[PDB]
Design a protein around this nucleic acid. Structure first.
Ligand code: MG
Ligand code: MG
Ligand code: MG
Ligand code: MG
Ligand code: MG
Ligand code: MG
Ligand code: MG
Ligand code: MG
Ligand code: MG
Ligand code: MG
Ligand code: MG
Ligand code: MG
Ligand code: MG
Ligand code: MG
Ligand code: MG
Ligand code: MG
Ligand code: MG
Ligand code: MG
Ligand code: MG
Ligand code: MG
Ligand code: MG
Ligand code: MG
Ligand code: MG
Ligand code: MG
Ligand code: MG
Ligand code: MG
Ligand code: MG
Ligand code: MG
Ligand code: MG
Ligand code: MG
Ligand code: MG
Ligand code: MG
Ligand code: MG
Ligand code: MG
Ligand code: MG
Ligand code: MG
Ligand code: MG
Ligand code: MG
Ligand code: MG
Ligand code: MG
Ligand code: ZN
Lengths: 82, 155, 126, 60, 208, 99
RNA sequence: AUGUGGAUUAAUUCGAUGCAACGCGAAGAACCUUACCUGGGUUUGACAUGCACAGGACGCCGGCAGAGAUGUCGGUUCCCUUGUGGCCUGUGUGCAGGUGGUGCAUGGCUGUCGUCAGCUCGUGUCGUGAGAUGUUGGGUUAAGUCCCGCAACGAGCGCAACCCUUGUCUCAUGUUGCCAGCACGUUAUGGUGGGGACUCGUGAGAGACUGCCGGGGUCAACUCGGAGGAAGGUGGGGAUGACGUCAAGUCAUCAUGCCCCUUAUGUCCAGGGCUUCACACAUGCUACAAUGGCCGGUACAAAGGGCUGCGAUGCCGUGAGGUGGAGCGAAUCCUUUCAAAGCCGGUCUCAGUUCGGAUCGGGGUCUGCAACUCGACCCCGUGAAGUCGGAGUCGCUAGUAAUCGCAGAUCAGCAACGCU
């Protein structure tokens, strides 16, 4: 877990994009190329398209998953069993 | 051992009492190479046996070793595609060493909940003739006298 | 002044002999206090016991390096050699007893690829 | 070692974390000793040739 | 592995370091520059055999001493190759660089240059048979040298196989540390690939 | 009372002994008191390398890096002696630190 | 906890496959290393050089757009001197560039037979010929080490020696090291004035050569015993791989012949991977409880590391650690007075246990721009399997086997129980 003194880490470009989105009140799907971006309460009603290496998979964020990284909810490996 | 009989180490004598049998016992019971621990445990168990029996610890140990030391053993041999056993006489020195070995073996595997007292009690049982060591000696002699027939091989 | 030095498995010792009483001075404390082991006391007193001049020499000991047994053996050798120096007339009995022969064994070099000393890694043909 | 990768490593990285040895001549990123600046085989060969003033076999 | 190089084995007794200098902080940069300049000189000069290259460093000043078969092309009558080498070193930033040329006494009494000659003869057109015969005869003719052993490994004659053949005469006591062995190694080029030649020379004994 | 710690630190025993001998002779000729090359423990650096790449690592060997250091405490640092020590030219195998 | 097999995945980069691969090439995989997969740029090109047509620019420090490369703009601009050198921006020309292939083409390096003692050549002689003698038999040794007669006479690589360490003594030698004998400390210890009388650390020499005696021996090798001596019959351990075999490993160290891409299989960056598992194998630690778990007191060593690094005393934290920072390029200052086992005192009376600790949750510290896949450390809750083990199988003959510790290599952070 990230230290509290350093605080949460958010990429500048994605922060700018989400700030513009929430300031203009428009809600759309944003192509997200960042896996190290932590979730912030401001993302309560924003949709992000995370890249798993194959195709940008949209994900809908709600207040429930606060405190968790974006890549946690985007599976990277496909395991169909045996 | 191909070249010939190797030299034998000059085993030291016990200064506490004066019998090298104590040194042999402590060396045999050495576990994980803790000399001080082994010797202190042996001395404590010897004192326990002394206070339990009311006699001389050295004398009772001599009685136990005399009672339990065998004189004939059994050796395995296979000839003509069949396995057989032959009885061969044993030197008293090796007999005493193996008697100590069996003493340790049967002082390892009983359920008295405390081995310090239990080794003393095992010594008392062996001296009295009710010990697992004397039972093993009985079995060994029985096997040897049963296989006496195949003694013609002489090996 | 009489001086002697004993070494065994990196156990250098110093002894100074004094015809006074049989007092044992090991770094400012008595033999019973320093390394309280019966085997130790026995081996340290073995030379004086053999020569039969007990309670006649006082020894002050300075110890550096080595272990307990190493220091005890080095001290035994040192007092034996000092006794011979002050009176070589006991040479033939002491050499027969083996008190004046040093112990030429110590920690030996250990191989690269071996765990330690002479150890050998598990050697399986599978 | 690829010459392009060697040149890129020699270039100044945008982050201090991206600094690594890349043994000078043979460009082996692994099995390199810092003070020598050379990898295991480089050290073996140079020492055997005797090109470094002070290294020598071991027998003690 | 079969044999360890006699040079490395006997470093501590008979042969001396061919480079002497002390440094610990700038030791990395110094070794880098020495190994560099050595490689650059090796790849630059090929026509004239160079036996050994020794470098001594004293603070800023550095002195390089060169042994070669013949100085005619190593240093020009006006200093052609000398000035090219100086310019090279100056580009490499050797600070104050001083050049000296030392000439060997017996051309074929040492391993390096005989190896160069054998490699050249093998490469151009000469057969390995005659190459070994002539090399051994020439090495023998010198009285001081006693034992010579030459080995050639690789593809010989263009055949699709590897031939490992060695010819021996005289002393080759590599186990005896007191003996004096000279070791050389060079690679001979050809159309079909690369060939390596190794030669051992024994020169008397040393006591002291 | 002033003393100068002339540090002699080299690799080769022959080189360090020769440098020490030259220093002793220079000091004796200049007329200054020197204790001499007091022996010091020699730092030992051992490095282990494998035989060849691509496994075959069971058999190894070690390389040492011999470093011999000697202590030279010179008493009465005469100006002539210090100047002579400055002007003395020593082989590259020996580096002298004055502190 | 590592490595592989087998199955998935777009990829889990490649090679090695009984002896002689399987804590391997990985002495430190979140970017780099990666060469794998998606996507976005790119072009005689990320990076060198010679020939023609265009020139004094190139080279650089910053704002703006972008997943990043990169595109556009703000500030400087040649050092020589008339021929151009240096450097490179646009066109190409050759050509760079490839961890793409080929260890059944190779150089070099390396493992095993094996630290086994065997393996050869000159002359001669014999037979026709492929060939034989020397290298046969007896004795002896760790050894083709040696003696005896023999068509053999000699020599070579090997064996021992010469090299390192360890076992002793003598001489030289006193600081940052020690204290015999004298003075100052007075709780802090040679700490301080002084001193080689021994170690202490590094220079020289001596000492093991069957040296001598008695018996066996062909009077010879060689062997048993005995005296002196530290060592007695190569004292101990090391450096040290004869010709060759295994088409043994290594084009993924490097270089190397040939084929292949060049507008790509080259090149820069954003995210993911090499740590995936319904199983198997190999190597290690923890054990499976009393020779013990736990608590308090308590004494004994070696060696090495330390500059953009060790880190004193003091203060706050249970502890990770936070502030601070003396002494150090280092017998001096730190790695605690280098300890663990060891000795004394107390509880547990044999339990799935006060042994034993993995898995799963709740709180923090440290290095890093970047700890979810994916690091390590501290605190708490959680309490699973496991009672000496099946046929089979492995190491070990003196400081040996067993048991308990310390430092270093790669390293800002560690996969550290592996290696030295
Ligand atoms: Mg194996
Ligand atoms: Mg790096
Ligand atoms: Mg590397
Ligand atoms: Mg030899
Ligand atoms: Mg493991
Ligand atoms: Mg693979
Ligand atoms: Mg395996
Ligand atoms: Mg396998
Ligand atoms: Mg391994
Ligand atoms: Mg990759
Ligand atoms: Mg990867
Ligand atoms: Mg390939
Ligand atoms: Mg292959
Ligand atoms: Mg064979
Ligand atoms: Mg004929
Ligand atoms: Mg024959
Ligand atoms: Mg024959
Ligand atoms: Mg013969
Ligand atoms: Mg033969
Ligand atoms: Mg031979
Ligand atoms: Mg003193
Ligand atoms: Mg061979
Ligand atoms: Mg092959
Ligand atoms: Mg093959
Ligand atoms: Mg190629
Ligand atoms: Mg090629
Ligand atoms: Mg191609
Ligand atoms: Mg390509
Ligand atoms: Mg990239
Ligand atoms: Mg992996
Ligand atoms: Mg463990
Ligand atoms: Mg605190
Ligand atoms: Mg302590
Ligand atoms: Mg637990
Ligand atoms: Mg637990
Ligand atoms: Mg525990
Ligand atoms: Mg169980
Ligand atoms: Mg149980
Ligand atoms: Mg079985
Ligand atoms: Mg690390
Ligand atoms: Zn390298």
């Amino acid at each position: 877990p990230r230290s509290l003194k350093k605080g949460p880490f958010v990429d500048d470009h994605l922060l700018k994009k989400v700030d513009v989105q929430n300031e203009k009140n428009t809600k759309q799907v944003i192509k997200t190329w960042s896996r190290r971006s932590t979730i912030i309460p401001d993302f309560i009603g924003h949709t992000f398209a995370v890249h798993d290496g194959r195709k940008h998979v949209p994900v809908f964020v709600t207040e429930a998953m606060v405190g968790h990284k974006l890549g946690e909810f985007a599976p990277t490996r496909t395991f169909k069993g045996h | 051992p191909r070249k010939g009989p190797a030299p034998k180490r000059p085993l030291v004598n016990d200064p506490v009492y004066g019998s090298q049998l104590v040194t042999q016992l402590v060396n045999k019971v050495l576990l994980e190479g803790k000399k001080s621990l082994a010797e202190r445990i042996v001395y404590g168990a010897l004192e326990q046996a002394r206070e339990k029996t009311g006699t001389d610890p050295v004398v009772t140990l001599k009685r136990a070793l005399d009672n339990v030391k065998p004189a004939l053993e059994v050796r395995s041999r296979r000839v003509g595609g069949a396995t057989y056993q032959v009885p061969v006489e044993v030197r008293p020195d090796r007999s005493t060493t193996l008697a100590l070995r069996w003493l340790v073996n049967f002082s390892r595997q009983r359920r008295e909940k405390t081995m310090v007292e239990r080794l003393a009690n095992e010594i008392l049982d062996a001296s009295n003739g009710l010990g697992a060591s004397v039972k093993r000696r009985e079995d060994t002699h029985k096997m040897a006298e049963a296989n006496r027939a195949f003694a013609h091989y002489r090996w | 002044p009489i001086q002697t030095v004993g070494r065994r498995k990196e156990a250098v010792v110093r002894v100074r002999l004094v015809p006074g009483t049989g007092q044992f001075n090991l770094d400012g404390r008595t033999l019973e206090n320093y390394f309280p082991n019966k085997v130790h006391q026995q081996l340290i007193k073995a030379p004086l016991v053999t020569v039969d001049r007990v309670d006649q020499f006082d020894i002050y000991a300075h110890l550096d390096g080595g272990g307990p047994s190493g220091q005890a053996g080095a001290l035994r050798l040192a007092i034996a050699r000092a006794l011979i120096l002050v009176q070589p007339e006991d040479r033939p009995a002491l050499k027969k007893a083996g008190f004046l022969t040093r112990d030429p064994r110590a920690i030996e070099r250990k191989k690269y690829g071996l765990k330690k000393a002479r150890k050998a890694p598990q050697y399986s043909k599978r | 070692a690829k010459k392009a990768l060697v040149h890129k490593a020699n270039k100044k990285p945008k982050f201090a974390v991206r600094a690594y040895t890349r043994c000078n001549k043979c460009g082996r990123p692994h099995s390199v000793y810092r003070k020598f600046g050379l990898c295991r085989i480089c050290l073996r060969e140079m020492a055997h040739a005797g090109e470094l003033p002070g290294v020598q076999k071991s027998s003690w | 592995g079969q044999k360890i190089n006699p040079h490395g084995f006997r470093l501590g007794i008979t042969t001396e370091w061919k480079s002497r200098w002390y440094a610990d902080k700038q030791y990395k940069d110094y070794v880098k520059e020495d190994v560099a300049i050595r490689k650059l000189l090796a790849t630059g000069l090929e026509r004239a055999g160079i036996a050994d290259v020794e470098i001594e460093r004293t603070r800023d000043r550095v002195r390089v001493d060169i042994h070669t078969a013949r100085p005619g092309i190593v240093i020009g009558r006006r200093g052609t190759e000398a000035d090219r080498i100086r310019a090279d070193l100056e580009k490499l930033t050797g600070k104050q660089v001083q050049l000296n040329i030392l000439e060997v006494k017996n051309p074929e009494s040492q391993a390096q240059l005989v190896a160069q000659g054998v490699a050249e003869q093998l490469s151009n057109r000469v057969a390995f048979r005659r190459a070994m015969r002539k090399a051994i005869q020439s090495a023998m003719r010198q009285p001081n040298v006693k034992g010579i052993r030459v080995q050639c490994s690789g593809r010989l004659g263009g055949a699709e196989m590897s031939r490992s053949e060695f010819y021996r005469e005289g002393r080759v006591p590599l186990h005896t540390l007191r003996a004096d062995i000279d070791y050389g190694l060079y690679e001979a080029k050809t159309t079909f690939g690369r060939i390596g030649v190794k030669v051992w020379i024994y020169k008397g004994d040393i006591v002291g | 009372g002033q003393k100068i710690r002339i540090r002699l630190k080299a690799y080769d025993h022959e080189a360090i002994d020769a440098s020490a001998r030259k220093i002793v002779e220079t000091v004796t000729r200049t007329g200054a008191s020197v204790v001499g090359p007091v022996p010091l423990p020699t730092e030992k650096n051992v490095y282990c390398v494998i035989r060849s790449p691509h496994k075959y690592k069971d058999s190894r060997e070690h390389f040492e890096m011999r470093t011999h250091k000697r202590l030279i405490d010179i008493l009465d640092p005469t100006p002539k002696t210090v100047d002579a020590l400055m002007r003395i030219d020593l082989p590259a195998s020996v580096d002298v630190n004055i502190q």
